[PDB]
Design a protein around this ligand. Sequence first.
Ligand SMILES: CCn1nc(C)cc1C(=O)Nc1nc2cc(C(N)=O)ccc2n1CCCCn1c(NC(=O)c2cc(C)nn2CC)nc2cc(C(N)=O)ccc21
Ligand SMILES: [Ca+2]
Ligand SMILES: [Ca+2]
Lengths: 179, 177
Amino acid sequence: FNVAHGLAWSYYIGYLRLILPELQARIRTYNQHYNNLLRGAVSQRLYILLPLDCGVPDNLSMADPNIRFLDKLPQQTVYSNSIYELLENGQRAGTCVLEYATPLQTLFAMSQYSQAGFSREDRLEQAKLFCRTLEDILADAPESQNNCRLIAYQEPSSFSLSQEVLRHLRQEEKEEVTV
Amino acid sequence: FNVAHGLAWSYYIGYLRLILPELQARIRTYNQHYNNLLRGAVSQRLYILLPLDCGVPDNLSMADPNIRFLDKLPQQYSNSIYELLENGQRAGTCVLEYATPLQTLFAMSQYSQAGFSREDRLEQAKLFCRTLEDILADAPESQNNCRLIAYQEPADFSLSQEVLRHLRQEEKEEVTV
Ligand SMILES: CCn1nc(C)cc1C(=O)Nc1nc2cc(C(N)=O)ccc2n1CCCCn1c(NC(=O)c2cc(C)nn2CC)nc2cc(C(N)=O)ccc21
Ligand SMILES: [Ca+2]
Ligand SMILES: [Ca+2]
């Protein structure tokens, strides 16, 4: 009995499969303004944060204060999407469309619902499974694996999410320019 | 690999568990107006349509012409009240809506990479029903706030009549027990 299968498939079929196609161009559009104005460009990929503690806060800033909301992204000329700037020592070091995964929140709710019989150990196993399954789905999906990137991580002590995101953005740019 | 397990748990945790508590009261209120005008009442339960074919239309009246939209419901998420008709006469009224996760099972069966056949879609649809049933069977006051209407449509069927069967059964239960 694995709720993570359905959660992954439903996140893809109901949300990613629909929103991603518009994206790769919507960001291309925005970067006209962004490049001309702030002398920086937004990464093309949609970054999906997958905290394995299934802890999705209301806003990204609360979890890490170096992730800072920048600007809402427009639609192609019913979905809101937020550009966040990543920070280092107060300086802008990257920008990206970055959002938490709703399925993970369901797993947290389940672990606080006693009639589920769903322990924290169960919750973590199912979070990992959600990650692996969504990976498999995007692997066989067209231009979608290319339009979005998954960032799974386990908090220990103190941890830096802005840094883990910047790792990925810098890797993405490395790829863009090399190949 | 049963997607229906996750789909059921997500439908309950992320949606039903949220709107049902409000709903009991919201309809309790609305009926103050309905009783005064037209001598009609709206059932307290939320009726969830589970077509086994997973065919969800964009407007219920297209699925059965005897199911006319009546009125949207106010808040304490959009829910719609429908009148069920017989020979043009109003025979019932209820908050009515489709289980949207079935849409997902439909999309999957039209998505070739998934290997999700129509046989699969039907198995997972039935399973979605059984799983959500169980969930509401352990849930507090929630089983009481809504009713599941799972039906399989025939090669050789009235939805408004299926629903009306349930509503009349509900009223029977109300006045006897
Ligand atoms: C967990 C909920 N549920 N589970 C399943 C399975 C089906 C549903 C379900 O019934 N849902 C839903 N019924 C609604 C009816 C009304 C009403 N009455 O009007 C208003 C809102 C309603 N909702 C919530 C909106 C869902 C769409 N949605 C998502 N969904 C996901 O992430 C997600 C997680 C899993 C698993 N599967 N999915 C895809 C369906 N993310 C969004 C982000 C934005 C944005 N960026 O603004 C906008 C919409 C978004
Ligand atoms: Ca190059
Ligand atoms: Ca049908």
